[PDB]
Amino acid sequence: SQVLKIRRPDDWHLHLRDGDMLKTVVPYTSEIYGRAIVMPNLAPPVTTVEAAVAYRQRILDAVPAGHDFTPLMTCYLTDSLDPNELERGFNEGVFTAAKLYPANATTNSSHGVTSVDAIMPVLERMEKIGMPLLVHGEVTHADIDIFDREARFIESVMEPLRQRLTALKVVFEHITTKDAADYVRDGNERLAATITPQHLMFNRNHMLVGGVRPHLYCLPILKRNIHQQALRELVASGFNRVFLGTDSAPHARHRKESSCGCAGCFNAPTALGSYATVFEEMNALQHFEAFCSVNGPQFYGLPVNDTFIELVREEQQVAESIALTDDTLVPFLAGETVRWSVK
Amino acid sequence: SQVLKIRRPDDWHLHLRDGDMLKTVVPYTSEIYGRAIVMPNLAPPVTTVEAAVAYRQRILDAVPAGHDFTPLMTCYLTDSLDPNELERGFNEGVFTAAKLYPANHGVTSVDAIMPVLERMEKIGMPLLVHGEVTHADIDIFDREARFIESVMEPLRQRLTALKVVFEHITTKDAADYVRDGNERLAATITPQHLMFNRNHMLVGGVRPHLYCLPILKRNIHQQALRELVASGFNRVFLGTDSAPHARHRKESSCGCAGCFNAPTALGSYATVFEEMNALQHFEAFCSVNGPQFYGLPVNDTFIELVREEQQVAESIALTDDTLVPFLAGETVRWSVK
Ligand SMILES: [Zn+2]
Ligand SMILES: [Zn+2]
Ligand SMILES: [Zn+2]
Ligand SMILES: [Zn+2]
């Protein structure tokens, strides 16, 4: 059985949630990845050093004995955020990056951004101190068709922002379109992107033909096949400013399989082997390690991990569900037979 | 306050299911509509006169005393259907129409059923079409449009006297196609495809109760459908595609397609016509255009809608599970008096 040995990977885009759900889901990340970028979209969000320090410790408390795992914390950008708080957290090694969610005029200033123009002082501060900006690049305006939201972000927000702040380092998180793949391919050394396993493995048909599949519902929404193919081609090319970010985003089963299902795939348990399957299919396994273990560190100016893990091409069955305190979590590819797993 | 009186409507596209579900859902149709086209996609499908006659009795058994409702039965077309079976059922008054479902027991090509279609054309039986292609690599949002080009237009060029209803049209492509067609081409439109677009199903959460086939399209398609009905074009008519499933078959890891809209469809169409400043065309959509296309008389009774806000029930009881109606828990602007 074929063996794939790689430097220990990292996850450059992760949701760990909090409380009991955090206790459940952390082990699936800590058992495999050395570090992860931990997103700040708690309720309430992580917008202060104190909260990030506290949250970091809750994460560390939940790491099983012996796992070598370091959470890399983020600040949720809001209109009200003091640039000095951000800077202090970056300087103290508490915030590795800050995250910009979609703007909306009606958002409370404690919970997000009304527009990019309103948070120039903080963005300028990030440019100054060399702090990376992580972007969920969709516009939210009600008239705009959901499938166009990412492309429209590129024209309306990302390009003007990058033209404004020429030294700002930006990660275009979880890209899902040819439009984004091309934009990132054609960008400079200050622009990178992450790609999830579901956006490489699937397109909107897998979510909507023969049934509606809420466990494949996530944001940005799965796009038509031509976009999926662009993404696969981008990672297969060896392009070195794209890297692993799972966007593992767990919700209890009853919240996914409801009359209004929550967005997000719980893909931490199965992402890495899914990535391996994609790179193999694209005849590009030579570029798999870099994607998983080198490109991200290089973009963030952090060291590459010096231990190794092995995947083995031996069929395993994914769990049907994973028990929480009250309900259950359905993992990405639940109940399926997968091609690659971790040894 | 505002009351709108209309000729009693008919539903030219309905799923009544069978067994306990049939018992629950029929009265929501029979209390309002004089007739309905009862689709044949049972399991197993209705592909014979005997099966159609039995199903029709099960339907009548479940109609409350005092409702004047006539189910109009259909044959489920299959590759191997005997044209004699279809015709006999038409001549006996059992089959009003035949329904073409592209496979995925459905039909795998128009060419495999040409003898059936030629007979239908001969005898003057209308063909009802679920107009989507199904090839795996064709994007779901394109399947209706591709069907027009690859299947519908070549079919109608080959059988120029065949009467065809393009069921539940969902696109500008279909709307223009039907608007520019001849007197042998008509269409039905559902309330959901007038009221909503794909953003309503997908933004801020995934909403399985708005998941139906053909899939809700982009807003420009929705607007084309609204403009078509509002124009007074007389070969579009009411067909709900009420397509009920138990709550937890909708709210699952793989939710079934279909909106249970019988309870709320008539009022929802009223809202759409009002919104388009086209209430003068509402009666004809509901109660005249379908009968004209099918060669049937219009109903000779009337009903009233009243513009008084009612809440739609959060659910409806079944023997097993519940049934969530279209617009459940929502306020609706018009209701039947
Ligand atoms: Zn995101
Ligand atoms: Zn995320
Ligand atoms: Zn249909
Ligand atoms: Zn139908």
UniProtKB/Swiss-Prot annotation, chain B:
Catalytic activity: (S)-dihydroorotate + H2O = N-carbamoyl-L-aspartate + H(+)
A Pfam family the protein falls into: Amidohydro_1
Annotated metabolic or biological route of this protein: Pyrimidine metabolism; UMP biosynthesis via de novo pathway; (S)-dihydroorotate from bicarbonate: step 3/3
Effect on the protein upon substituting D241E: 24-fold decrease in catalytic efficiency with carbamoyl aspartate as substrate
EC number: 3.5.2.3
Expression triggers: Induced by pyrimidine limitation.
Zinc is among the record's keywords: yes
Positions that bind Zn(2+) 1: H13, H15, K99, D241
Residues at the active site: D241
Effect noted on mutating D241 to A/H/N: Lack of activity
Alphabetical keyword list: Hydrolase, Metal-binding, Pyrimidine biosynthesis, Zinc
Coiled-coil residues: none
Protein's UniProt keywords contain Hydrolase: yes
Cofactor(s), by name: Zn(2+)
Enzyme class name: hydrolase
GO cellular component: cytoplasm; cytosol
Family statement: Belongs to the metallo-dependent hydrolases superfamily. DHOase family. Class II DHOase subfamily.
Function: Catalyzes the reversible cyclization of carbamoyl aspartate to dihydroorotate.
Subunit structure, interactors included: Homodimer.
Domain notes: There is an asymmetry between active sites in the dimer, with dihydroorotate bound to the active site of subunit A and N-carbamoyl-L-aspartate bound to the active site of subunit B.
UniProt protein name: Dihydroorotase
Organism, scientific name: Escherichia coli (strain K12)
